[PDB]
Structure 1
Amino acid sequence: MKVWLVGAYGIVSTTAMVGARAIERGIAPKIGLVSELPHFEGIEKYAPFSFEFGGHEIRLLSNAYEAAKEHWELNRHFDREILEAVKSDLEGIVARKGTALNCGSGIKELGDIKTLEGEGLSLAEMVSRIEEDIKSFADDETVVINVASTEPLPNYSEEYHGSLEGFERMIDEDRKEYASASMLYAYAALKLGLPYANFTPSPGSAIPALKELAEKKGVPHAGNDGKTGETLVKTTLAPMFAYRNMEVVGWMSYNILGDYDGKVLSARDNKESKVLSKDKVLEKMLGYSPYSITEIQYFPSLVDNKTAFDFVHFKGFLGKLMKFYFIWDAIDAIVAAPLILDIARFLLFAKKKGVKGVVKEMAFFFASPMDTNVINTHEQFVVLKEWYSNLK
């Protein structure tokens, strides 16, 4: 299958590419791949483990190997022998210039960038380049996945976001104020009849306009925002207090990280998308609102080794207060990268099975899952297993 990655030179993107190749060459295990669990045996009938890659970027590098290597130098998150083994493969992956339209002040942290909008292109002209890029690469087994930097909250517009007609009128009118890069890539993917997933808390296809487009086109889509680390633990652990009839009175989540993701998320406007995603999970599992504080701060020495410190203050029998602490220490690209490959496979599977619109049953992968109130990790995994079984 083919995967078009928006933000193709990112650490998550390049690790997914390195990882695909290393597994295909038989020099890495299948650990971390949800699609490789016994319950999903038979997936390879519709979505075998075989990947070709293309994508959009705004940072300037020659190919995905120079990109993967840049990240590897700072993080060393796979062995040099894996880097060497996948070199000629990744050297052949060359991203196309994309759009960073309305992607927030955090974008400046990426350094040297080139964009479609910086060429003077209108919305219609940008959509045409984006679509030409993708359609030149795409086949009948192609999926588009957004792993680009996190955008700020979009400028609100009922008219331009509320219906596909309104959104297409937005493009016709070149009303850039109400468009963001993530909507334009999603629009392009769905217009081309290609399954789409959003690994970020940027809007992407999560607006009614694009939800309507996906349904009309009969195209499956999924998101938003990878649930890889702290939020995974949060949606696994929070239910434990509810099952035991305890009240969570306070929940602190402090996340520190470096690298390009920490760098963009350090900006107050970009950060807001992520912070809301992380916070709002508690109410959806508990029914009520614990005093919740969630922060992300740049901490350059950690690079891609995002560390989270959580503190849960909870009441039990006779109103007595008690304390739980956790510290999560992992490489963000390690927990994220296989999920990209898993999502591509589940999207292709769903496409072949005639699924269209929001694949709500893919909630398990996401911190802000579209069209569902299933947030509990355990319930989500059951829903994913049962969905697949019902379609296999």
Structure 2
Amino acid sequence: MKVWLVGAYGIVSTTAMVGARAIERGIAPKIGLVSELPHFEGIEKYAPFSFEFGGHEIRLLSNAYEAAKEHWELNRHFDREILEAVKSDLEGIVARKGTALNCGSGIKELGDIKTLEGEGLSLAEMVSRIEEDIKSFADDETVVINVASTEPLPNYSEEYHGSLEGFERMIDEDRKEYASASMLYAYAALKLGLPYANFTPSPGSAIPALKELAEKKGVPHAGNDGKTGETLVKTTLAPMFAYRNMEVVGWMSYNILGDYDGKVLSARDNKESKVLSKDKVLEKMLGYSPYSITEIQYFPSLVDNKTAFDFVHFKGFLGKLMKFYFIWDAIDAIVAAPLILDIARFLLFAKKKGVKGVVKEMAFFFKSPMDTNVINTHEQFVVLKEWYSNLK
């Protein structure tokens, strides 16, 4: 199948790409792949484990391997043997000039940046470019996944964001104001009849406009922020107290990271996005709002080794307060990189099973699920499970 990646040079895109061909070459085991669990067997008939990549990007590199070798020097999240060996497959992957419209002043790492608006461009011609780039790559088994970096919180207007006739006029009114980059991608792909997936905390297809579109064109889309490590753990441990009819007092979340992602989440603009999702998760799991603290600080030495520090203050039986801590220590590119593949694969399956509109049974992967207030891990996982069952 073919995958069209946004921000195709990121640590997670290339972990994907390196991963996919490592397994295809029967080199790498398939650990992490949710699509490979014993409950979804048979999925190879509609979504076999075979991949073809391409996509947009705004970082100036040669191809996809030279972007993959870069992040590896910093983190080395996989042995040098798997990279050299997949060095060839990716020398042919070459991202194309994309757009970065309204994505925070937390952006600065490319002296060269004459990209979309860089070239004195219009909404119209920008959309035509992106459309023309996915178009020439896309086939019948193609999926578009946003994996670029955290954008700020755009200001929704129901005029240009609340009716496909609006957003389409927003493009004709050259309204670069309300237009965000992650909307152009979703609109691009949903337009082209391709299934879309948003791993990032950006709105993307998460607007009324770009909901009316898929549904009107029969496209099953899904997302709103990979739930890959910390938040996984909190959406898995919080209901534990609701089951034991204890009350939580305060939850503290504290995360420190330093590569391109930690780099952009530095400011309180774009960072302000993703922070939210990992905060609000808790109300909708308990039915009460404990005092919650969630912060993400820069920490250059860890690079992609996202570390997270949690403490939960909880009360039981006789009014007592008690205490629970956990430290998460992993490399984001490892817990996220399969998800990008599981997603493509469930989305391809969905497409073929006549699934259109949003896939609220894919909540399992995301921390801001569209059209659902299912946050509990084993409960999302059951819904994910009972969905497939019902379509097999």
Query: What TM-score does the superposition give when structure 1 sets the normalisation length?
Result: 0.99
Deviation at 1:111, TM superposition (A): 5.4
The answer (yes or no) to whether the contact 2:313–2:324 under 8 Å persists in 1 is: yes
Structure richer in helix, relative to its length:
1
Cα distance change, pair 355–327 in 1 and its aligned pair in 2 (3 A): same
Cα distance, 1:169 vs structure 2:
1.0
Give me the whole-angstrom Cα distance separating, in 1, the residues matched to 2:159 and 2:359: 25
> Structure 1 pair 110/245, CA: closer, same or farther in 2 (3 Å)?
farther
The 1-side partners of 2:387 and 2:226 are apart by 19
SS of the residue 1:361 aligns to: coil
Retained in 1: the 8 A contact 2:235–2:281?
Answer: yes
1:244-284 Cα shifts (integer Å, max 9, x gaps): 00111100000000110000011110111011111010001
| Cα contact 1:59–1:114 (8 A) shared by 2 | no
**Which residue is equivalent to 2:287?**
287
Residue 166 of structure 1 and its aligned partner are, at CA, apart by: 1.1
Q: Tell me the CA shift for residue 113 of structure 1.
A: 3.1
Compute the displacement of 1:112 (Å). Answer: 4.1
> What do residues 104-133 of structure 1 show as CA deviations (whole Å, max 9, x unaligned)?
111225554341111111111100000000
Question: How do residues 248-267 of structure 1 correspond to structure 2 at under 5 angstroms?
Answer: 248-267=248-267
1:189 CA drift (Å): 0.3
SS in 1 for 2:312: strand
Report % sequence identity. Answer: 100
CA deviation vs aligned residue, 1:333-369 (integer Å, no higher than 9, x gap): 0000000000000000000000000100000000101
Residue 318 of structure 1 and its aligned partner are, at CA, apart by: 1.4
Once the two structures are TM-superposed, the CA of residue 156 in structure 1 deviates from its matched residue by 2.5
Q: 2:313 maps to what in 1? A: 313
Q: Quick check: 1:306–1:331 contact (8 Å CA) kept in 2?
A: yes
What's the C-alpha RMSD, in Å, of the aligned pairs? 0.8
CA contact (8 A) 1:312 1:324 kept: yes
Q: Does the 8 Å CA contact 1:109/1:264 hold for their aligned counterparts?
A: no
The C-alpha deviation readout for 1:58-79, integer Å capped at 9, x for no partner, is 0100100000000000100000
1:191-210 residue CA offsets vs partner (Å, 9 max, x unmatched):
00000000001011000000
Three-state SS of the structure 1 residue aligned to 2:53 is strand
State the partner residue of 2:389: 389
SS at 1:301's partner residue? coil
Question: What is the Cα deviation at residue 47 of structure 1?
Answer: 0.3
CA deviations on 1:24-51 (whole Å, 9 max, x unpaired) are 0011100000000000101101000000
CA distance in structure 1 between the aligned counterparts of 2:231 and 2:114, rounded to whole angstroms: 33
Deviation for aligned residue 1:312: 0.2
SS in 1 for 2:30: coil
Distance across 1 between alignment mates of 2:186 and 2:16: 20
For residues 161 and 46 of structure 1, do their structure 2 counterparts lie closer, same or farther at Cα, with a shift above 3 Å needed? same
Structure 1 distance, partners of 2:281, 2:132, is: 38
Checking the alignment, whether the CA contact within 8 Å between 2:227 and 2:366 is kept in structure 1 is yes
Cα separation, 2, equivalents of 1:147 and 1:267: 19
Separation (CA, whole Å) in 2 of partners of 1:82 and 1:113: 32
**Larger displacement relative to structure 2 (112-121 or 221-230):** 112-121
1:50 aligns with 50
Q: Corresponding residue for 1:233?
A: 233
Query: Gaps (5+ residues) in structure 2?
Result: none
Could you tell me which residue of structure 2 aligns to residue 326 of structure 1?
326
Q: Once the two structures are superposed, what CA deviation does each residue of 1:221-245 show, in whole Å capped at 9, x if it has no partner?
A: 0011000010000000001000000
- Describe the SS at the equivalent of 1:207: coil
Structure 2 distance, partners of 1:302, 1:139, is 40
Partners of 1:84 and 1:113 lie apart in 2 by 29
CA distance in 1, matches of 2:295, 2:51: 36
Residues 4-32 of structure 1, C-alpha deviations (whole Å, 9 max, x = no match):
00000000000000000100001110000
Taking the aligned partners of 1:114 and 1:341, their CA distance within structure 2 comes to: 31
By how many angstroms is 1:218 displaced?
0.6
State whether residues 214 and 221 of structure 2, in contact with CA within 8 Å, keep that contact through their aligned partners in structure 1.
Answer: yes
Deviation at 1:158, TM superposition (A): 1.7
Counterpart CA distance in 1 for 2:270 and 2:313 is: 29
- Runs of 4+ off more than 6 Å: none
Q: Secondary structure at the match of 1:358?
A: coil
Is contact 2:60–2:110 with CA below 8 Å preserved after alignment?
A: no
Q: Is the 8 A contact 1:12 1:147 kept in 2?
A: yes
In 2, Cα distance between the equivalents of 1:217 and 1:270?
31
Conservation of the 8 A alpha-carbon contact between 1:16 and 1:337: yes
Measure the CA separation in 2 of the matches of 1:40 and 1:111: 46
Unaligned runs of 5+ in 1: none
Report the CA distance shift for 1:38/1:111 in structure 2 as closer, same or farther (over 3 A).
farther
Q: How does 1:1-392 map to 2 (within 5 A)?
A: 1-109=1-109, 112-392=112-392
SS at structure 2 position matched to 1:155: coil
**CA distance in 1 between partners of 2:285 and 2:34 (Å):** 23
Deviations 1:143-183 (A, max 9, x none): 00000011000123121111111111100100010011000
